[PDB]
């Protein structure tokens, strides 16, 4: 009464008032913001089929902090393949910065387990930040980080997460990005015994490619169903979740577009 | 002829809807403010914002120095409590902007890089500048607060989004807006671009308790039109001087005072 549509709302807004940049064309707006109350449903979009298994597998692998694509393939996820080299290696992308941001001693920082310690010990911390925008290592990455930083925050025993995402393919990328951080934020809350607050997605260039005009125009005509809800069995730590611990229930998306 | 007040709007929202905590704060997380820069210079008029200091800290960031000295020599004491016997701060803000240390022993000038791509690849969706150098955090007197920003070009107009992890809504934020707005102006002038929006996205946006009355006083004032920024095209991004930056037609309500 009704179902919130912060995503489709932004989707629409860009199509109507985005300006046009020019190897295929786009219409963009800059600096937008989406937010979901996580208690209020799991934000896996229903106006089109968002494949959740790959959302989950990417995340578990981000969390392993490994830069070889193997474990994805071994688990039937090929979304990173095209960027891998012959040996299946991508450079120090997302997970690698997250678990092992290198320092000029011999060592590395684990911002994930870092971030966890400060949830448990200091929830009011105003500096609970993970970053993958490691300026000095970008040259070595297959692809410069897109969703490049997020911040954790606690109010009334409820965890919120904000994501800064530099560039957003509204149609193909975003929905997938938001389901992935919504899940990570659920994992964080569970591993520190807290309820879930909001996920805030904040973007730079939020864009629709010209070749999505018809597809977007379509999704935009469908009415939303209620969001599914997330079922999460508690693993022993952030780094020991498996596919079996993670399911959505009551997910009834409209059919895929594309 | 209505004056947008997104800053005050957020202030109002935090006071009305925020979440209290324990020297205490009331807070909201993940908030955004935008100004149309072509609509004037976002120097608050619901209270006198000191500008010379804003301009001072910026020039300082941009010359990229660990030391506090240039600021002392120009009557800016605001970083004095943080610096050691030598006036040294560690590789805070400006050191990362101009010389983010590479593992191959070099340094990345991000400001130059950003300008370079404003000029050569304006469409680029990767024009990032960051101060959040995880590996240097611990050498910093203070961890970066306004910690990354992105540039973007729409229709010849330049826009800037700042991500700021933590926000003293009353005391620090108005300086932060002024500073970044002036910053985006400097980028645009040099790139030969016009000005679009400035966007302030914050993480933990709080009003400190010891500022309740100061905030109600401010909220109680009808706002005045923003001054306009007169900026004189210096030779590079790094050649700007106080002579170069003034604000005209600035009509603020009386100074409101708070401490930390
Ligand atoms: O997690 C991601 C990664 C990439 N993209 C999209 C946005 C851009 O269209 C493209 C990245 O290209 P550049 O912004 O670097 O040009 O991929 C996303 O939407 N989400
Ligand atoms: O540019 C700045 C730097 C700091 N702060 C505020 C936010 C916090 O109240 C305090 C920084 O302290 P921590 O959040 O890191 O504890 O100062 C600002 O408002 N603007």
Q: Domain segments of chain B: what residues?
A: 1-260
Which residues, 6+ apart, have CB-to-CB distance to A139 below 8 Å? none
Cα–Cα distance measured from residue A45 to residue A179, given in angstroms and rounded to the nearest whole number: 8
Give residue A65's region: left, alpha or beta (phi > 0; psi -120 to 50).
left
Cα–Cα distance measured from residue B21 to residue B38, given in angstroms and rounded to the nearest whole number: 38
Question: Which residue, among A258, A176, A161, has the nearest Cα to A218 in the 3D structure?
Answer: A258
Question: Which residue, among B152, B134, B151, has the nearest Cα to B143 in the 3D structure?
Answer: B134
Which residues, 6+ apart, have CB-to-CB distance to B113 below 8 Å? none
| Dihedral pair phi/psi, residue B53, rounded to 5° | -70, -40
Alpha helices in A122-156 (DSSP H): none
Cite the active site residues of A.
Answer: 146
CATH architecture observed for domain B1-260: 2-Layer Sandwich (3.30)
Which residues in chain A touch residue B159, judged by CB atoms under 8 angstroms apart?
Answer: 30-31
| Dihedral pair phi/psi, residue A211, rounded to 5° | -65, 5
Cα–Cα distance measured from residue B101 to residue A63, given in angstroms and rounded to the nearest whole number: 26
Elucidated via:
X-ray
Cα–Cα distance measured from residue A47 to residue B148, given in angstroms and rounded to the nearest whole number: 33
Could you say which DSSP state residue A207 is in?
Answer: E
Query: In which residue are the tokens 């450079």 written?
Result: A91
**B238 CB-side CA count, 13 A:** 12
Q: After which residues is chain A broken (C to N over 2.5 A)?
A: 22
Q: After which residues is chain B broken (C to N over 2.5 A)?
A: 22
Cα–Cα distance measured from residue B134 to residue A79, given in angstroms and rounded to the nearest whole number: 28
Q: Any binding-site annotation on B221?
A: no
Mode of pairing for the β-strands spanning A108-109 and A129-131: unpaired
Tokens standing for B74?
A: 């120009």
Q: Whose CA is nearest to atom 3 of ligand 1?
A: A146
* B83: number of Cβ within 10 Å: 18
Cite the active site residues of B.
Answer: 145
Contact (CB<8Å) B100/A136: yes
Tokens standing for A61?
A: 């692998």
* A72: number of Cβ within 10 Å: 21
Cα–Cα distance measured from residue A217 to residue A148, given in angstroms and rounded to the nearest whole number: 29
Which CATH number is associated with domain A1-258?
Answer: 3.30.572.10
Which residues, 6+ apart, have CB-to-CB distance to A78 below 8 Å? A72
Angle between helices B173-191 and B110-120 (to 10 degrees): 50
* Bridge partners for B19 per DSSP: B27
| Dihedral pair phi/psi, residue A20, rounded to 5° | -105, 120
* A107: number of Cβ within 10 Å: 9
* Bridge partners for B164 per DSSP: B146, B202
Contact (CB<8Å) A102/B135: yes
Question: Which residue, among B6, B35, B9, B15, has the nearest Cα to B206 in the 3D structure?
Answer: B15
Gap from A198 CA to chain B (nearest CA, Å): 9
Cα–Cα distance measured from residue A163 to residue A167, given in angstroms and rounded to the nearest whole number: 12
Cα–Cα distance measured from residue B208 to residue B18, given in angstroms and rounded to the nearest whole number: 11
- CA of residue B22 relative to chain centroid, distance: 27
| Dihedral pair phi/psi, residue A248, rounded to 5° | -95, 140
Query: In which residue are the tokens 């590996």 written?
Result: B135
CA dihedral B180, B206, B145, B256 (to 10 degrees): 50
Contact (CB<8Å) A133/B126: no
SS3 label, residue A33: strand
Contact assessment for residue A224 and residue A9, using Cβ atoms and an 8 Å cutoff: no
Query: In which residue are the tokens 């809350």 written?
Result: A189
Sign of CA dihedral B244, B250, B253, B254: positive
Please tell me the distance between residue B6's alpha carbon and the centre of ligand 2 in angstroms.
20
Alpha helices in A30-104 (DSSP H): 52-64, 70-73, 94-100
CB-based contact, B243 to chain A, within 8 Å: no
Give residue A250's region: left, alpha or beta (phi > 0; psi -120 to 50).
left
Resolution in A: 2.8
Q: Please tell me the number of the ligand nearest to residue A153's CA.
A: 2
Which residues, 6+ apart, have CB-to-CB distance to A91 below 8 Å? A67, A137, A140, A141, A142
Contact assessment for residue B83 and residue B90, using Cβ atoms and an 8 Å cutoff: no
Contact (CB<8Å) A30/B148: no
CB-based contact, A135 to chain B, within 8 Å: yes
CA dihedral A140, A141, A142, A147 (to 10 degrees): -160
Gap from A68 CA to chain B (nearest CA, Å): 22
- CA of residue B236 relative to chain centroid, distance: 20
DSSP assignment of chain B equals -----HHHHHHHHHHHH-EE----EEEEEEEEEEEEGGG-----TTTT---HHHHHHHHHHHHT-SBSHHHHTTT--TTGGG--TTSB--S-HHHHHHHEE-TTS-EE-HHHHHHHHHHH-TT-S--EEE---GGGGGGSSS--SEEEEEEEESSSEEEEEEEEEEEETTTTHHHHHHHHHHHHHHHHHHHT-EEEEEEEEEEEEEEEGGGHHHHHHHHTSPP-PPPEEEE---SSTT---GGGEEEES--PPP------
Q: Please tell me the number of the ligand nearest to residue B141's CA.
A: 2
Question: Which residue, among B174, B200, B169, B168, has the nearest Cα to B253 in the 3D structure?
Answer: B174
* A86: number of Cβ within 10 Å: 5
Q: How are strands ordered across the β-sheet holding B25-36? A: B19-20, B25-36, B194-208, B157-168, B146-153, B128-130
Mode of pairing for the β-strands spanning A19-21 and A26-30: antiparallel
Contact assessment for residue B164 and residue B176, using Cβ atoms and an 8 Å cutoff: yes
């Amino acid at each position: 009464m009704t179902v919130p549509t912060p995503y489709e709302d932004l989707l629409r807004k860009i199509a109507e008032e985005g300006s046009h940049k020019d190897g295929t064309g786009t219409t963009s707006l800059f600096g937008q913001q989406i937010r979901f109350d996580l208690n209020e449903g799991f934000p896996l979009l229903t106006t089109k089929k968002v494949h959740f298994h790959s959302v989950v597998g990417e995340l578990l692998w981000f969390l392993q902090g490994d830069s070889n694509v193997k474990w994805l393939q071994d688990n039937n996820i090929r979304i990173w393949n095209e960027w891998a080299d012959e040996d299946g290696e991508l450079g120090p992308v997302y997970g690698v910065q997250w678990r092992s941001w290198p320092t000029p001693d011999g060592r590395h920082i684990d911002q994930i387990s870092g971030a966890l310690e400060t949830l448990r010990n200091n929830p009011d911390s105003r500096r609970n930040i993970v970053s993958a925008w490691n300026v000095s290592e970008l040259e070595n990455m297959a692809l410069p980080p897109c969703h490049l930083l997020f911040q954790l925050y606690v109010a009334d025993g409820k965890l919120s997460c904000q994501l800064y995402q530099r560039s957003a393919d509204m149609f193909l990328g975003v929905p997938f990005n938001i389901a992935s951080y919504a899940l990570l934020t659920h994992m964080f809350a569970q591993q520190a015994g807290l309820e879930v607050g909001e996920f805030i997605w904040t973007g730079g260039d939020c864009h629709i490619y010209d070749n999505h005009k018809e597809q977007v125009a379509e999704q935009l005509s469908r009415e939303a169903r209620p969001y599914p809800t997330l079922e999460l069995n508690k693993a022993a730590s952030m780094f020991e979740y498996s596919f079996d611990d993670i399911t959505v229930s009551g997910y009834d998306p409209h059919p895929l577009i594309r």
